[PDB]
Amino acid sequence: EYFTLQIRGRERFEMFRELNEALELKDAQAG
Amino acid sequence: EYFTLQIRGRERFEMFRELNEALELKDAQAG
Amino acid sequence: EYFTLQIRGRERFEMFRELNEALELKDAQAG
Amino acid sequence: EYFTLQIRGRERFEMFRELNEALELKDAQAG
Lengths: 31, 31, 31, 31
What we know:
The structure is a homotetramer.
Chain A: E1 3-7, H1 10-28
């Protein structure tokens, strides 16, 4: 049930944040 | 500065989880 | 602008393959 | 074993380039 991941690095977070965002978009076009 | 990012993806999270642990190891060598 | 990247990891490649297709999708929606 | 992945992005490539180099380093620690 969900997995919280704390990232101390601001850059690293931005990366995963971009992947998480693009991942959610794929779901919209992949049910 | 830590950042909590909740993700509902076992694979997606596993990715960032490996990228976070891999990025921390590189710091030990880098400067 | 192209950069041929050769890797001996079927798993690692599969990852970037998903990230590549996910990046093109998010880029198409944005501008 | 090899998998040539043609990338058409300087940023995207830089990402996989860091993930590829970071993955190879893990092999030295884990095996």
